[PDB]
């Protein structure tokens, strides 16, 4: 009863901003987005995800959600007296007896801000009234009397899709609050739906929800629902990546600045699993350097273990240890020896790391690595030794890497010419490579070919800083 005043304070600090302030920031505002309380409220949703939200236990049971959902009314200017009601109900938790009125009694509590009066006209208060109670209910997925209620609470959020689709009847851009909240809560939709089974008609929910956000309000909805759709097609069988190959409409303002980062990460995993080295490793690199901060403990780490699988598949990677969280060490007990097996050319160790860690390789679940990692070992060999010597013999490298015959070394050198690393040809009598390196290739007009892209890229960023200087 002395700690629940801290949810009592932060609860009023949240819906003061959200309800009164973003309702006044919805009345006449939002020239581009003057709803700064929307980003303030997403900051407080991250704050309720750091802390306990409001009333999971909090030394009592079920105090705030029966309390504050009453009596908003949006009327004559003594609705700060309804705020005074909200404030002076707080003798119940400290003084009186707490009673259980959440997760069961919420079904008319959500209908209370509609059945008080014709409160107001805008949907962000309705999204508030169905989000700010019900998002404090989702992160307790103990699957007993709590997850069927997340299920029904997000059925009320599907009614919030209905009252996102048929409210204000055209063009009041409250989607720059409700899609900002709906990104979060539709991720939690996908979470709670797939804590039990794969989601089937929620796929068409997501399809038509992507459809309705096409042009009339195309603001933070398309990219986030596309992240949902992408991770949907990622977790399950892989049939509709041709949909991105035919309907590539994936380019917003890239607003949330981490949504785009992890979006490029997920589609880097896509192009990694389709087939790619180059474009996939460069978008993995761009998402890597587009890691927003390290202010969230060890969350880059497992996702980075699966990120640089393609760099392992390059063969030109050293040990990756600068990323290593020490709490990731006991999980990379396979992965450290795996990049050691990348640095080593042993064959028995190449399959004994597999024979030692196939279960964590299934935890990866991406045996596209092992279907080409032997080929990566022989390409590491050919890159090293073909960069090493000018006129090597195929027998030297062959029976240095246990090939035992000339003709499969010929097929190796031939498929390496076909893969195009070095000039190396065969002094054809019985093999016996006659070859060369390549210095004096070119060094002057060829840099200034790429310097067009250098400085044209620089002037692009000049004009982008100009169009960013435009903002204050």
């Amino acid at each position: 009863p002395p700690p629940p005043p801290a949810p009592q304070d932060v609860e009023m600090k949240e819906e003061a901003a959200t309800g009164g302030g973003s309702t006044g920031e919805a009345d006449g505002k939002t020239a581009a987005a003057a709803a700064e309380h929307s980003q303030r409220e997403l900051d407080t949703v991250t704050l309720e995800d750091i802390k306990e939200h409001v009333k999971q236990l909090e030394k009592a049971v079920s105090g705030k959600e029966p309390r504050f959902v009453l009596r908003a009314l949006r009327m004559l200017p003594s609705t700060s007296r309804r705020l005074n009601h909200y404030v002076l109900y707080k003798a119940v938790q400290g003084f009186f007896t707490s009673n259980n009125a959440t997760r069961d009694f919420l079904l008319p509590f959500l209908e209370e801000p509609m059945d008080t009066e014709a409160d107001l006209q805008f949907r962000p208060r309705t999204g508030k009234a169905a989000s700010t109670p019900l998002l404090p209910e989702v992160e307790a997925y103990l699957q007993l009397l709590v997850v069927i209620f997340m299920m029904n609470s997000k059925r009320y959020k599907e009614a919030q899709k209905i009252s996102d689709d048929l409210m204000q009847k055209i063009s009041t851009q409250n989607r720059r609050a409700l899609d900002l909240v709906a990104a979060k809560c539709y991720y939690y939709h996908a979470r709670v739906y797939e804590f039990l089974d794969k989601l089937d008609v929620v796929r068409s929910f997501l399809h038509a929800r992507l459809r309705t956000a096409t042009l009339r309000h195309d603001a933070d909805g398309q990219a986030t629902l596309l992240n949902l759709l992408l991770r949907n097609y990622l977790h399950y069988s892989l049939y509709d990546q041709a949909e991105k190959l035919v309907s590539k409409s994936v380019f917003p303002e890239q607003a949330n600045n981490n949504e785009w980062a992890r979006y490029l990460y997920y589609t880097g995993r896509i192009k990694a699993i389709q087939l790619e080295y180059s474009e996939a490793r460069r978008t993995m690199t761009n998402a890597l350097r587009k890691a927003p901060q390290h202010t969230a403990v060890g969350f880059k780490q497992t996702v980075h273990k699966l990120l640089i699988v393609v760099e392992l598949l390059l063969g030109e990677i050293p040990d990756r240890l600068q990323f290593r969280q020490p709490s990731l060490k006991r999980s990379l007990m396979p992965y450290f020896l795996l990049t050691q097996a990348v640095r080593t050319g042993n064959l028995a160790k190449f399959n004994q790391v597999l024979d030692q860690f196939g279960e964590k390789f299934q935890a990866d679940g991406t045996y596209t690595l092992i279907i080409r990692l032997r080929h990566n070992v022989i390409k590491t060999g050919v890159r090293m030794i073909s960069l090493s010597y000018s006129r090597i013999s195929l027998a030297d490298i062959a029976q240095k890497l246990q090939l035992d015959s000339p003709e499969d070394a010929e097929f190796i050198v031939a498929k390496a010419i076909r893969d195009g690393v070095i000039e190396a040809s065969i002094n054809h009598e019985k093999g016996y490579v006659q070859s060369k390196e390549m210095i004096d290739i070119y060094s002057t007009r060829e840099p200034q070919l790429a310097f067009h892209q250098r400085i044209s890229f620089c002037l692009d960023i000049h004009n982008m800083s100009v169009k960013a200087m435009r903002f204050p």
Partner: protein
């Protein structure tokens, strides 16, 4: 910023980066690298 799939997810160690640029290379061995003199 945890909003993605992830809610289910230089003492002897930066010397280990150059040493894993060295692990497949000549551990110490010191005799081999001193007895390559006198076999000719």
């Amino acid at each position: 910023m945890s909003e993605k799939k992830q809610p289910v997810d230089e003492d002897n160690w930066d010397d280990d980066n150059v040493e894993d640029d060295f692990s497949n290379q000549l551990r110490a061995e010191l005799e081999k690298h001193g007895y390559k003199m006198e076999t000719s």
